[PDB]
């Protein structure tokens, strides 16, 4: 009767002793809501396996004989051949279906769990928060008794049909969702989110159009997107648990998740969170909801009778708890403590630390950092002759997350070291020079450009000495820089650079980019032209007009870092645009009746639109025709009815599913019965890739 017991569902006396705590955490509860959540989660993962896990693209990702650089968490892991991987994904699909239908539930959970984590750990570049969440949910549900309501296993076994479940099944899931929301909220107490920098361009979307009717865009990008996000994180964490606030919280969270789903392309995360939101309701809502149906509907829906006793719960008359009862409470407490601690475990695993905190995926810092890379240079020195050469930025790689983490860079360096001898290169030394800015700051180096990464020292628990610190002393400049961005014309472009003392940047201005200038904002640098070996020492507020088509160098020779800017206009692009505008003006003058004289021979293809029975068109004519064709195609695309777009979307998804199933069938046949003739394989591959139509 006490208000504390009514609000929180338990009295303090239940926490007096361990036995009473176990009895509280193992009290009876209705099994319906857990069953509904099981069905929704299983169905969503079944739909998600052929789309995001990569069943359709697996044939061009783990192709045999191809030399690519993987990024596994453990170097001991190695991918298996493609056929065995397809078998693993088939086991994943079977486990997901079994969880959805509740048939051999524990085996289904295990068969989904072990492959999923194996795939998740195999490639660090495919880590995201929602994949980690799906993994954690699958791990949790392996122990939970979710096969008690609306399950085929119940029909196959009467003892586990419409029976009670212990209370900790709901408690662990509620704690997980609360931890997700609360950690997401608290992580967003950073200067780059409360100030509106991260995701600043989300306020122009048409979904925010009604908000603009009362607020300006600049304020709408701060009060609504960011502050609304933080407040909604905390509110979704806390409101749903209490009785009075459930309706408003459900409405806000549902609308928030729908808007997030339509704004972003995260995938199935928003739908899974929508499925999890009802879990805070009473544990018996589906049963009483079904009770409000006519007799005919009830004949096929699950049972409406009251639940029967179970054997994995403590019933009060005294019943002595067994062993599973205690282990349930122990698992609940330890798992919740581990979930709380893991996001803040970055002070132990400092080898993975960078400008950001730890690897991406297990911190719930969703959409809080944005990065803009400017350049990536890979230099190699041959170990026998002394030659110096340059590799392509992204060779032997399938992702671009190696530009932001030291460990991935080390693995990439080792991969290059082992693979380069296939191209007549002896034992090399590899140097990296990468330019990146986070949340619209000066472009600065992220890694030391003088350190051989192959021979560099890296361990998981020790800080790296070749990761440049993030210079936040240049943070307030983000105001003034933005103003400079708004005072330029449609052709001029500006690139901001912040450089460390002693290091120098070597650049080659292309022949097209005439009218390029360098200006110093803070510090003291020396700009050297190598054609005549002449350098000028620049002070603040001085500008130099650099050569176009040669190399220059900029050296920093001050006690502190120097910030400067490159301002350029593509002269070739301007000339091409002016010539195209002149040609368009002549075409319009001819069309509207002016210029009565005969058209030039080169203009004849333009009006005709097809070069048939005549000399080949000039490059300018080709460019004009291509631009007109592209404009017409874009215009046709924009003026497209919604039903056609929806039909194309459905057809494309059907193609993806069909390709996945056919490739899996071919792989399984090859694995079981062996390999048929090569021409048959080519024909089958052609058949699988065929568009449905």
């Amino acid at each position: 009767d006490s208000r504390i017991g009514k609000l929180l569902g338990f009295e303090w006396t239940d926490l007096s002793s361990w036995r009473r705590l176990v009895t509280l955490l193992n009290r009876p509860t209705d099994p319906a809501s857990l069953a509904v959540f099981r069905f929704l989660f299983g169905f969503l993962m079944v739909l998600d396996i052929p789309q995001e896990r990569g069943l359709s693209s697996l044939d061009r990702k783990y192709l045999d004989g191809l030399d690519v650089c993987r990024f596994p968490l453990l170097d001991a892991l190695r991918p298996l051949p493609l056929d065995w991987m397809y078998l693993v994904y088939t086991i994943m699909f079977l486990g997901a279906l079994g969880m959805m239908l509740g048939l051999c539930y524990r085996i289904s959970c295990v068969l989904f769990l072990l492959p999923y984590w194996y795939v998740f750990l195999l490639d660090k570049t495919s880590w995201n928060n929602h994949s980690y969440l799906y993994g954690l949910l699958a791990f949790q549900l392996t122990f939970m008794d979710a096969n008690h309501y609306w399950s085929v296993d119940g029909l196959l076994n009467a003892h586990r049909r419409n029976a009670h479940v212990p209370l900790w099944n709901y408690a662990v899931l509620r704690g997980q969702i609360f931890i997700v929301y609360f950690i997401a909220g608290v992580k967003k107490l950073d200067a780059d989110w409360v100030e509106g920098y991260s995701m600043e361009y989300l306020s122009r979307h048409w979904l925010f159009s009604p908000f603009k009717l009362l607020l300006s865009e600049e304020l709408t990008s701060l009060l609504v997107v960011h502050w609304g996000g933080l407040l909604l994180d905390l509110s979704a964490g806390f409101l749903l648990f209490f009785d009075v606030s459930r309706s408003i919280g459900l409405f806000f969270v549902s609308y928030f998740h729908c808007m997030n789903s339509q704004l972003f392309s995260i995938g199935m995360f928003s739908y899974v969170m929508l499925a999890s939101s009802p879990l805070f309701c009473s544990p018996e809502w589906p049963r009483k909801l079904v009770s409000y149906c006519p007799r005919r509907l009830q004949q096929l829906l699950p049972l409406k009778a009251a639940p029967q006793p179970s054997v994995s719960c403590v019933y009060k008359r005294g019943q002595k708890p067994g062993l599973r009862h205690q282990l349930g409470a122990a698992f609940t407490l330890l798992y919740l403590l581990e979930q709380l601690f893991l996001p803040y475990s970055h002070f132990l695993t400092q080898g993975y630390n960078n400008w950001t905190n730890g690897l991406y995926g297990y911190s719930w810092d969703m959409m809080v950092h944005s990065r803009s890379h400017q350049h990536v240079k890979i230099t190699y020195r041959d170990g026998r002759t002394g030659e110096l050469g340059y590799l392509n930025p992204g060779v032997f790689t399938q992702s671009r997350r190696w530009k932001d983490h030291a460990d991935m860079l080390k693995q990439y360096a080792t991969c290059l070291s082992r693979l380069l001898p296939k191209y007549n290169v002896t034992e090399p030394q590899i140097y990296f020079d990468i330019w990146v800015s986070i949340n619209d700051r000066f472009q600065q180096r992220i890694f030391d450009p003088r350190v051989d990464i192959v021979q560099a020292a890296w361990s998981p628990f020790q800080r790296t000495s070749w990761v440049q610190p993030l210079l936040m002393d240049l943070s307030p400049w983000r105001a003034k820089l933005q103003e400079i961005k708004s005072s330029l014309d449609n052709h001029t472009e500006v690139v901001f650079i912040a450089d460390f003392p002693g290091l120098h940047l070597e650049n080659f201005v292309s022949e097209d980019l005439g009218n390029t200038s360098i200006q110093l904002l803070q510090g003291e640098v020396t700009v050297e032209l190598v054609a005549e070996q002449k350098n000028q020492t620049l002070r603040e507020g001085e500008k130099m007009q650099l050569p176009a088509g040669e190399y220059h160098k900029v050296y920093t020779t001050s006690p502190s870092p120097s910030c400067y800017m490159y301002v350029y206009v593509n002269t070739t692009e301007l000339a091409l645009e002016q010539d195209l505008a002149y040609l368009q003006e002549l075409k319009e003058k001819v069309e509207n009746g002016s210029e009565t004289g005969p058209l030039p021979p080169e203009l004849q293809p333009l009006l005709e639109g097809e070069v048939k029975g005549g000399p080949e068109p000039t490059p300018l004519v080709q460019t004009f025709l291509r631009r007109q064709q592209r404009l017409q195609e874009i215009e046709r695309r924009r003026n497209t009815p919604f039903h056609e777009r929806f039909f194309r979307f459905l057809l494309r998804k059907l193609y993806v599913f069909r390709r996945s199933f056919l490739m899996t069938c071919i792989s399984l046949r090859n694995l079981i019965l062996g390999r048929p003739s090569l021409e048959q394989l080519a024909q089958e591959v052609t058949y699988a890739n065929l568009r449905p139509f």
Binding site: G54, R371, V395
Partner: protein
């Protein structure tokens, strides 16, 4: 294209976002993705987001 030229390697002032958008639009796998990127923010911002559901894979396909 494993080895890149000395002259072409040292080009800091080469449009990352414009080049990526042009490559995506020209590529058959893009076009619609290239058009969305042009209408939307730069693809570099999308990559910096890091939560996209295989944005590179979707653009390739």
């Amino acid at each position: 294209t494993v080895f890149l030229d000395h002259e072409n390697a040292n080009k800091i002032l080469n449009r990352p976002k414009r080049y990526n958008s042009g490559k995506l639009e020209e590529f058959v796998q893009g076009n619609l993705e290239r058009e969305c990127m042009e209408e939307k923010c730069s693809f570099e911002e999308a990559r910096e987001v890091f939560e996209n559901t295989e944005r590179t894979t979707e653009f390739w396909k």
